[PDB]
Amino acid sequence: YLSQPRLTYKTVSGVNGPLVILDHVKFPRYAEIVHLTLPDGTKRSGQVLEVSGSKAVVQVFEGTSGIDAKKTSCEFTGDILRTPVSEDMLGRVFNGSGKPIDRGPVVLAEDFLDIMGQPINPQCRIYPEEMIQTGISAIDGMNSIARGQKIPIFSAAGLPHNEIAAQICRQAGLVKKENFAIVFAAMGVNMETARFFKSDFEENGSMDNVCLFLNLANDPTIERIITPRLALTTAEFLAYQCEKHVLVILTDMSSYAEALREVSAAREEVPGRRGFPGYMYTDLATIYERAGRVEGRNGSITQIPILTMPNDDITHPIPDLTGYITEGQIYVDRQLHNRQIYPPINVLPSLSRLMKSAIGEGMTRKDHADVSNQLYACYAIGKDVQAMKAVVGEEALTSDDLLYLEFLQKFEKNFITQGPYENRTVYETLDIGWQLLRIFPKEMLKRIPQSTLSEFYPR
Amino acid sequence: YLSQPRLTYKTVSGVNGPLVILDHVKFPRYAEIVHLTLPDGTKRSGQVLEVSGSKAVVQVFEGTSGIDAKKTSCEFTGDILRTPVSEDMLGRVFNGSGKPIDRGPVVLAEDFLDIMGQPINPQCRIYPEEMIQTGISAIDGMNSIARGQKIPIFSAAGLPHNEIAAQICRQAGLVKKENFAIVFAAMGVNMETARFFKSDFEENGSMDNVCLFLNLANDPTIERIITPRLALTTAEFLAYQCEKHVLVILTDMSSYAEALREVSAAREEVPGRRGFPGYMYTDLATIYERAGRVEGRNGSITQIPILTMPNDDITHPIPDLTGYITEGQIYVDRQLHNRQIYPPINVLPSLSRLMKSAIGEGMTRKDHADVSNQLYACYAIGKDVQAMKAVVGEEALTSDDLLYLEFLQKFEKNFITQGPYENRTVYETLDIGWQLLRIFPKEMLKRIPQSTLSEFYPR
Amino acid sequence: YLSQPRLTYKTVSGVNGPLVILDHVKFPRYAEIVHLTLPDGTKRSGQVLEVSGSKAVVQVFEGTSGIDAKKTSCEFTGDILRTPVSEDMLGRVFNGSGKPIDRGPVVLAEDFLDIMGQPINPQCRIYPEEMIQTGISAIDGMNSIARGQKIPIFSAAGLPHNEIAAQICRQAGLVKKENFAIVFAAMGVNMETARFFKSDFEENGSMDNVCLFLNLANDPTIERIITPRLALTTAEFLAYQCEKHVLVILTDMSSYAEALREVSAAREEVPGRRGFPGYMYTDLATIYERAGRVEGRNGSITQIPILTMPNDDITHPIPDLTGYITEGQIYVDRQLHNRQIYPPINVLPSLSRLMKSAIGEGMTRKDHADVSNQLYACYAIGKDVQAMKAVVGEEALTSDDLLYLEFLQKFEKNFITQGPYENRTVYETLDIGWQLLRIFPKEMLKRIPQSTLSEFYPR
Amino acid sequence: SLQTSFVTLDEAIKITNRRVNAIEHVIIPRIERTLAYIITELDEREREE
Amino acid sequence: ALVANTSNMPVAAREASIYTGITLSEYFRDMGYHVSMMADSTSRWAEALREISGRLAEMPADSGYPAYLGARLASFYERAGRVKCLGNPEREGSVSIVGAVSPPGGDFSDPVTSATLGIVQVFWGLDKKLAQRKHFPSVNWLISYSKYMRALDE
């Protein structure tokens, strides 16, 4: 606590777009939170971005319209933005500023954390082990998410990245061969989609384990920047202090990146590559890397950042800088979507670098690794045979080629195509895999050891 | 009547490129005019670009060479450059600032008009309809021009855009079932071109209705910023007060745009694409839109501006911003010119927005709209076939592709190719159109209704 | 001389990157040298690149790390970097700052020359008309070297351009059927490269005629843009005051360009291409043009500014601007090196701008020019034939094409391939030329007149 | 028929392989050089801004 | 007569050299002679303008060049031409200008080549790939043009 009376200033040097420049401010802090009172009694929030002597420069969260240089007062809190956190806030819905928008009370805090936090000391970081099943076969039997990795979903604009994200929140959980929570943050979301998330989470009973942050497209752009920090700040409290596993989903990081560029312009910084700040790399790492396991504690944080690829070009700095510091990718395609496949996830370009540790005896099932590798080869071959068929015709194909075409057609129809309300656990996903693999005789399943085939292949 | 003596200053602050900065000026008026007397007696003029306190920045039209910072006398007119205009300006040649170059007297001020332009109330603007029969099949057939339209000719350096513009001027007229006055603004035009147009107007006996404004390539580059405003100001007097129909030709908006760039850079303004002022769009809109008809008048202004495209592209800011303002273009290409095709006009990237309404029963021919669309599609396809042939060879095309290739070759030879001293009517142009369309069997002419085909196709 | 005591300042205004800004300086001189001592006794030097009033901007060669603001002591020498030069610098090894590093004494000057030098009066410059016999057929035949000519080797990282330069140093003579003083500027190179040349010069028994200037990869980057001037300044003393024929070799000029680019960025100068200063050409000319013979004096300077081409990009500003200044290039590539061909010299993209005058009757043999031109035609065509045959196959070729493949194959292994110690005469090179030309019938040797074929071809 | 089938096949293979070789040795290299050229020029425009 | 302002001479002098040369050309033009001057660079002059503009801290335009680059080239080339001379003796003269340009990399896209092509009426484009084959003069003959064909047909 400070127990120091706050100072309120009526001295304003000028106002320039989103910024208000104050004067005669006593020992101002950088990143200090202040509150403005306009002549009409309207209150606004803001944050100090520059303090050059007594000339404090504050960015106003809301619009600066209506602010004068004679009557507007600025109340200083004497501190920076610290988020009230508790276990009870799980099951609540908040806006970007951390305020409730679910008609519930303000959070009754157990502590206050600096939302910027600190990096996790690498000496106490534990390599990812067990798996967190998502319920979506395309990313459980092919590229599973290890309990501690960070694997993004890259999508083009217009693809159902928000519907999949909502499905993961409803279905995700532990393998279960009470301590699992999901923190969901949507940045720059439009009103129709924001309603979708809120209503879909409430109706299906999942809300008890979801902490939802909604930053709407028409909300202040600076609030969009702290939104993912508040989500992770909660995740760190829940995960590391309350000994539980937290799945954090950061939706539309591309909208975050645009908000970050806006803040950079407010500081009159010269834009870097493709208009983005030269520090975009470390800023994404600052958010992304606040995850993983820690020594001596049973909690964990995983992340599934979701990013829209501008112009569907994976080379763009946003997916490029993200992927360069994440472990593999899910990758949602367009061809599968136009073919009316849901989920439209393309297994050939996807990768989960930690899958080798996520799956196996004692974590999922003995045959997990073998089924995945054989299915991947079979799908890749089926696509190759399909390309051949288009040139040589059906009569030019042999029996083995026909089996690969049968697999290809049934793989997409049975294994990848799921529906938004069918929850397929890791064991059902593997059983579906075997149903497709039993299309082939044993001798064609070259990537599955004979011991595995004898145990699982028949029946 | 402003019967108030003028102030003359020697309080020159400094001179920087085309800009002269004055201080200690009493109540500076924005966009005022200053007459500069150099120490050697040379008189020059300039226009105020900005004022602040007792300082003003003056844009010197004739150039700043020879100006000192001690003796140069600066006379402030007290008003905005309102230019003398007269109905008898036709049959005269003026320089880029509106002064006689033809050994005639200074134009007698029948009245004065503010060259900045007086915005016309869109409610009283009359939609253009009547088609101008230019004689050029590439225009009269496909991209027809209505009287009051705004259709610039894009070209790159070295192409015969001066010949096309000259041909339109002497062949201009209406589709019949009496003529135009010419206001010709030369901006950065070399002497060889200047005499080309001047001689063509004289040889055809047009000078009785031509007013030239010549700012040549060897003349001052700041002066040409007003030159186009002086030309249109006269056009507006003649068209809207003297009930004349005026065709306005602007020889190059690119040398104009460069003149704006020189000034914009001189005052250290924040540029946009390729170094041009962020307000280029407005500076062009205020010139291009001085066209069309108004309620209560019988005259009109039709604009056909010319723009040289740097690097042969059409994404350069100059043609890019023009395309957003004007109602289509002609776009003179280079691939047609290299093949000795004249006029070398490429019909695919060129459109005329008013074409859909200035043609059809009651204006040209019932089938005009149908013939245009079918010919356009046929040409576009022929080019795609040519693009394939270049890769697969002439031996890898089907019968239909050959029909489009035959169309493509005959289309450019018989339809587009014309010659500079032959005019064809809209009805003759369509008859040629039909000769090209009759290359195809009726079943392939999918953009012409069956009723139209049965009336004309078998003829 | 300068008899007045020099002043010492403790008036450093501030430090910004590599530039130390002093105030309160008495009558600052542009391009004067300042010596500065750091609080710990370290001595460093720099040059005034800007003066304004009482302020001066000093660029420090060693660097600005550790430069203080209160205790830094600077003194102004009162002149430009004039350096001591003497004849007995041959056989000495210096660093990039002009100091000895061979444990010998400092230079006992015969005079002091301005490192910036002076341009040679073009009226007294005498056109080169003597040939140097390099012993390399790839050069002596098709791209002859004149005495006083500027010929860099365009190379790429990993190619043996250091071996070629070393070879040239030993077996470079005259075709008048001679001991060159070599000045070797080793800048931006590792120890092993500098030791390679130093050892080779001793192995050749010529070290008493070699002056070395070393500036290694671990040396300051600002000294790397005076080292060439130090080498050339010494060369000018030897060539134009002591009438000694000097060969000046500058190691990877790209380290010069990179050192210059760093300075350009530090001073915020106008970029041209790839971030290099818009004046890069002028700066390179200052270095390169210190070459050639002068009428009335028996000395000469020949340059070989070898440079590494970044990413083998022949259009990179470094080889591009050099190509515009020097009399052509030798140019090696990876296509020859990857086949164990030495020297890996590719004649096609190479040229010697003085060859037309250094060969022929009275110089070498009268058929020299004719043999070279036809070999260029045959070599280029053989490359064109491979470009075709790679797609169409050997069966698509006729006897007219196979001859060029036979020529190309025999040309590369007989004419270009030699070995590090194969020293051929110019006459032997031409005889080899004919042996390859005799692959074709007389009618196909279309670059050679019958007045030459009838004499030489039959043999 | 064997021999005649072999006939229509030797020409078909040479014609198909020639087209494949051109794509690989002529058309794509040219597209890659164009793309790399564009990428470089775009960064040059970014720098002057 | 010839003017030397070599690459390793003061860069500012490159502007004076270009104008000095053409001024001399006009002098002889006025005397009834046909003058055919040639400046073997152009790009080096525009380069001087860029270097000075930089030192001046002026706002650059396309690729670092001054916004007024086109203004300088236009007024330079327009001093060429066949003229009737001033003076009672009724002389006839001309100045031709054959100016080289040095585009970096051979890419005909720089502000100097682009602006020049909008000014000059004859385009003698050279192809580096022809020079490599010693096909001299290395004229492209596909991109070159001359707008005086019709003038000389008579």
JSON list of C-alpha atoms in Angstrom, two decimals, chain B residues 64-173:
[
{"chain": "B", "resi": 64, "resn": "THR", "atom": "CA", "xyz": [14.02, 32.80, -57.74]},
{"chain": "B", "resi": 65, "resn": "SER", "atom": "CA", "xyz": [17.39, 33.21, -59.47]},
{"chain": "B", "resi": 66, "resn": "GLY", "atom": "CA", "xyz": [18.80, 36.69, -58.90]},
{"chain": "B", "resi": 67, "resn": "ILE", "atom": "CA", "xyz": [16.76, 37.49, -55.77]},
{"chain": "B", "resi": 68, "resn": "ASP", "atom": "CA", "xyz": [18.81, 38.84, -52.89]},
{"chain": "B", "resi": 69, "resn": "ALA", "atom": "CA", "xyz": [17.93, 39.24, -49.22]},
{"chain": "B", "resi": 70, "resn": "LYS", "atom": "CA", "xyz": [18.40, 43.02, -48.92]},
{"chain": "B", "resi": 71, "resn": "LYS", "atom": "CA", "xyz": [17.04, 45.01, -51.87]},
{"chain": "B", "resi": 72, "resn": "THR", "atom": "CA", "xyz": [14.31, 42.90, -53.50]},
{"chain": "B", "resi": 73, "resn": "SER", "atom": "CA", "xyz": [11.02, 44.80, -53.19]},
{"chain": "B", "resi": 74, "resn": "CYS", "atom": "CA", "xyz": [7.88, 42.79, -52.41]},
{"chain": "B", "resi": 75, "resn": "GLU", "atom": "CA", "xyz": [4.54, 44.36, -53.34]},
{"chain": "B", "resi": 76, "resn": "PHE", "atom": "CA", "xyz": [1.47, 42.69, -51.84]},
{"chain": "B", "resi": 77, "resn": "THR", "atom": "CA", "xyz": [-1.58, 43.03, -54.06]},
{"chain": "B", "resi": 78, "resn": "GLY", "atom": "CA", "xyz": [-4.08, 42.65, -51.23]},
{"chain": "B", "resi": 79, "resn": "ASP", "atom": "CA", "xyz": [-6.17, 40.11, -53.15]},
{"chain": "B", "resi": 80, "resn": "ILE", "atom": "CA", "xyz": [-6.26, 36.59, -54.57]},
{"chain": "B", "resi": 81, "resn": "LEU", "atom": "CA", "xyz": [-5.05, 35.93, -58.12]},
{"chain": "B", "resi": 82, "resn": "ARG", "atom": "CA", "xyz": [-8.32, 36.70, -59.90]},
{"chain": "B", "resi": 83, "resn": "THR", "atom": "CA", "xyz": [-7.41, 36.53, -63.57]},
{"chain": "B", "resi": 84, "resn": "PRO", "atom": "CA", "xyz": [-8.71, 38.76, -66.36]},
{"chain": "B", "resi": 85, "resn": "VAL", "atom": "CA", "xyz": [-10.93, 36.81, -68.73]},
{"chain": "B", "resi": 86, "resn": "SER", "atom": "CA", "xyz": [-12.60, 37.79, -71.99]},
{"chain": "B", "resi": 87, "resn": "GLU", "atom": "CA", "xyz": [-14.71, 36.11, -74.64]},
{"chain": "B", "resi": 88, "resn": "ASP", "atom": "CA", "xyz": [-12.20, 37.34, -77.23]},
{"chain": "B", "resi": 89, "resn": "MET", "atom": "CA", "xyz": [-9.36, 35.28, -75.73]},
{"chain": "B", "resi": 90, "resn": "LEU", "atom": "CA", "xyz": [-10.00, 32.83, -78.57]},
{"chain": "B", "resi": 91, "resn": "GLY", "atom": "CA", "xyz": [-7.59, 33.36, -81.42]},
{"chain": "B", "resi": 92, "resn": "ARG", "atom": "CA", "xyz": [-4.81, 34.22, -78.98]},
{"chain": "B", "resi": 93, "resn": "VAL", "atom": "CA", "xyz": [-1.71, 32.50, -77.61]},
{"chain": "B", "resi": 94, "resn": "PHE", "atom": "CA", "xyz": [-0.66, 33.12, -74.01]},
{"chain": "B", "resi": 95, "resn": "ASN", "atom": "CA", "xyz": [2.30, 31.96, -71.98]},
{"chain": "B", "resi": 96, "resn": "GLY", "atom": "CA", "xyz": [2.03, 29.85, -68.85]},
{"chain": "B", "resi": 97, "resn": "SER", "atom": "CA", "xyz": [0.98, 32.81, -66.69]},
{"chain": "B", "resi": 98, "resn": "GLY", "atom": "CA", "xyz": [-1.66, 34.09, -69.08]},
{"chain": "B", "resi": 99, "resn": "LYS", "atom": "CA", "xyz": [0.39, 36.85, -70.69]},
{"chain": "B", "resi": 100, "resn": "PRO", "atom": "CA", "xyz": [0.54, 37.51, -74.46]},
{"chain": "B", "resi": 101, "resn": "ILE", "atom": "CA", "xyz": [3.25, 35.71, -76.41]},
{"chain": "B", "resi": 102, "resn": "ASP", "atom": "CA", "xyz": [1.67, 36.29, -79.82]},
{"chain": "B", "resi": 103, "resn": "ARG", "atom": "CA", "xyz": [2.63, 39.98, -80.15]},
{"chain": "B", "resi": 104, "resn": "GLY", "atom": "CA", "xyz": [-0.95, 40.89, -79.28]},
{"chain": "B", "resi": 105, "resn": "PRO", "atom": "CA", "xyz": [-2.05, 43.15, -76.44]},
{"chain": "B", "resi": 106, "resn": "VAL", "atom": "CA", "xyz": [-2.67, 42.16, -72.85]},
{"chain": "B", "resi": 107, "resn": "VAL", "atom": "CA", "xyz": [-6.11, 40.60, -72.55]},
{"chain": "B", "resi": 108, "resn": "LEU", "atom": "CA", "xyz": [-8.64, 43.26, -71.64]},
{"chain": "B", "resi": 109, "resn": "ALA", "atom": "CA", "xyz": [-10.37, 42.40, -68.38]},
{"chain": "B", "resi": 110, "resn": "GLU", "atom": "CA", "xyz": [-13.96, 41.86, -69.47]},
{"chain": "B", "resi": 111, "resn": "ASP", "atom": "CA", "xyz": [-14.20, 40.37, -66.00]},
{"chain": "B", "resi": 112, "resn": "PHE", "atom": "CA", "xyz": [-12.11, 38.68, -63.34]},
{"chain": "B", "resi": 113, "resn": "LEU", "atom": "CA", "xyz": [-12.42, 35.15, -61.99]},
{"chain": "B", "resi": 114, "resn": "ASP", "atom": "CA", "xyz": [-10.69, 33.51, -59.04]},
{"chain": "B", "resi": 115, "resn": "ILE", "atom": "CA", "xyz": [-8.60, 30.77, -60.62]},
{"chain": "B", "resi": 116, "resn": "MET", "atom": "CA", "xyz": [-9.04, 28.64, -57.49]},
{"chain": "B", "resi": 117, "resn": "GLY", "atom": "CA", "xyz": [-12.49, 27.72, -58.82]},
{"chain": "B", "resi": 118, "resn": "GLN", "atom": "CA", "xyz": [-16.00, 28.28, -57.59]},
{"chain": "B", "resi": 119, "resn": "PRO", "atom": "CA", "xyz": [-17.55, 24.95, -56.54]},
{"chain": "B", "resi": 120, "resn": "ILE", "atom": "CA", "xyz": [-20.68, 24.07, -58.49]},
{"chain": "B", "resi": 121, "resn": "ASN", "atom": "CA", "xyz": [-23.71, 22.82, -56.54]},
{"chain": "B", "resi": 122, "resn": "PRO", "atom": "CA", "xyz": [-24.13, 19.11, -57.41]},
{"chain": "B", "resi": 123, "resn": "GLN", "atom": "CA", "xyz": [-27.90, 19.63, -57.30]},
{"chain": "B", "resi": 124, "resn": "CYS", "atom": "CA", "xyz": [-27.73, 21.83, -60.41]},
{"chain": "B", "resi": 125, "resn": "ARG", "atom": "CA", "xyz": [-25.18, 19.70, -62.26]},
{"chain": "B", "resi": 126, "resn": "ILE", "atom": "CA", "xyz": [-26.67, 18.16, -65.41]},
{"chain": "B", "resi": 127, "resn": "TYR", "atom": "CA", "xyz": [-25.75, 14.58, -66.20]},
{"chain": "B", "resi": 128, "resn": "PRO", "atom": "CA", "xyz": [-23.96, 14.33, -69.58]},
{"chain": "B", "resi": 129, "resn": "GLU", "atom": "CA", "xyz": [-25.54, 12.18, -72.28]},
{"chain": "B", "resi": 130, "resn": "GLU", "atom": "CA", "xyz": [-24.76, 13.22, -75.86]},
{"chain": "B", "resi": 131, "resn": "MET", "atom": "CA", "xyz": [-21.95, 11.17, -77.39]},
{"chain": "B", "resi": 132, "resn": "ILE", "atom": "CA", "xyz": [-18.94, 12.84, -78.99]},
{"chain": "B", "resi": 133, "resn": "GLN", "atom": "CA", "xyz": [-18.02, 11.12, -82.25]},
{"chain": "B", "resi": 134, "resn": "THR", "atom": "CA", "xyz": [-14.24, 11.22, -82.13]},
{"chain": "B", "resi": 135, "resn": "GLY", "atom": "CA", "xyz": [-13.61, 9.30, -85.32]},
{"chain": "B", "resi": 136, "resn": "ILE", "atom": "CA", "xyz": [-11.35, 6.81, -83.56]},
{"chain": "B", "resi": 137, "resn": "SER", "atom": "CA", "xyz": [-12.78, 3.29, -83.50]},
{"chain": "B", "resi": 138, "resn": "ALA", "atom": "CA", "xyz": [-11.08, 2.46, -80.20]},
{"chain": "B", "resi": 139, "resn": "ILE", "atom": "CA", "xyz": [-13.09, 5.30, -78.63]},
{"chain": "B", "resi": 140, "resn": "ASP", "atom": "CA", "xyz": [-16.33, 5.61, -80.59]},
{"chain": "B", "resi": 141, "resn": "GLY", "atom": "CA", "xyz": [-16.89, 1.86, -80.58]},
{"chain": "B", "resi": 142, "resn": "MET", "atom": "CA", "xyz": [-15.92, 0.66, -77.11]},
{"chain": "B", "resi": 143, "resn": "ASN", "atom": "CA", "xyz": [-14.91, 3.50, -74.76]},
{"chain": "B", "resi": 144, "resn": "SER", "atom": "CA", "xyz": [-17.16, 6.25, -76.08]},
{"chain": "B", "resi": 145, "resn": "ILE", "atom": "CA", "xyz": [-16.92, 9.78, -74.70]},
{"chain": "B", "resi": 146, "resn": "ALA", "atom": "CA", "xyz": [-19.92, 11.83, -73.60]},
{"chain": "B", "resi": 147, "resn": "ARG", "atom": "CA", "xyz": [-19.91, 15.60, -73.81]},
{"chain": "B", "resi": 148, "resn": "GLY", "atom": "CA", "xyz": [-18.93, 16.82, -70.36]},
{"chain": "B", "resi": 149, "resn": "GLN", "atom": "CA", "xyz": [-16.93, 13.71, -69.56]},
{"chain": "B", "resi": 150, "resn": "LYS", "atom": "CA", "xyz": [-13.48, 13.48, -67.95]},
{"chain": "B", "resi": 151, "resn": "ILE", "atom": "CA", "xyz": [-11.38, 10.91, -69.80]},
{"chain": "B", "resi": 152, "resn": "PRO", "atom": "CA", "xyz": [-7.60, 11.47, -69.71]},
{"chain": "B", "resi": 153, "resn": "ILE", "atom": "CA", "xyz": [-5.20, 9.75, -72.10]},
{"chain": "B", "resi": 154, "resn": "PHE", "atom": "CA", "xyz": [-2.52, 7.79, -70.28]},
{"chain": "B", "resi": 155, "resn": "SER", "atom": "CA", "xyz": [0.73, 7.12, -72.13]},
{"chain": "B", "resi": 156, "resn": "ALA", "atom": "CA", "xyz": [4.40, 6.52, -71.50]},
{"chain": "B", "resi": 157, "resn": "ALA", "atom": "CA", "xyz": [7.27, 8.52, -72.95]},
{"chain": "B", "resi": 158, "resn": "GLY", "atom": "CA", "xyz": [7.76, 8.10, -76.68]},
{"chain": "B", "resi": 159, "resn": "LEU", "atom": "CA", "xyz": [4.24, 6.99, -77.58]},
{"chain": "B", "resi": 160, "resn": "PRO", "atom": "CA", "xyz": [2.06, 8.98, -80.02]},
{"chain": "B", "resi": 161, "resn": "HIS", "atom": "CA", "xyz": [-0.27, 10.51, -77.45]},
{"chain": "B", "resi": 162, "resn": "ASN", "atom": "CA", "xyz": [0.21, 13.96, -79.01]},
{"chain": "B", "resi": 163, "resn": "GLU", "atom": "CA", "xyz": [-1.02, 12.64, -82.36]},
{"chain": "B", "resi": 164, "resn": "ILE", "atom": "CA", "xyz": [-4.12, 11.03, -80.83]},
{"chain": "B", "resi": 165, "resn": "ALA", "atom": "CA", "xyz": [-5.02, 14.17, -78.89]},
{"chain": "B", "resi": 166, "resn": "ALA", "atom": "CA", "xyz": [-4.52, 16.30, -81.99]},
{"chain": "B", "resi": 167, "resn": "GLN", "atom": "CA", "xyz": [-6.65, 13.93, -84.06]},
{"chain": "B", "resi": 168, "resn": "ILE", "atom": "CA", "xyz": [-9.48, 14.11, -81.52]},
{"chain": "B", "resi": 169, "resn": "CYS", "atom": "CA", "xyz": [-9.36, 17.91, -81.49]},
{"chain": "B", "resi": 170, "resn": "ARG", "atom": "CA", "xyz": [-9.78, 18.34, -85.26]},
{"chain": "B", "resi": 171, "resn": "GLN", "atom": "CA", "xyz": [-12.18, 15.40, -85.68]},
{"chain": "B", "resi": 172, "resn": "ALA", "atom": "CA", "xyz": [-14.36, 16.20, -82.66]},
{"chain": "B", "resi": 173, "resn": "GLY", "atom": "CA", "xyz": [-18.11, 16.32, -83.11]}
]
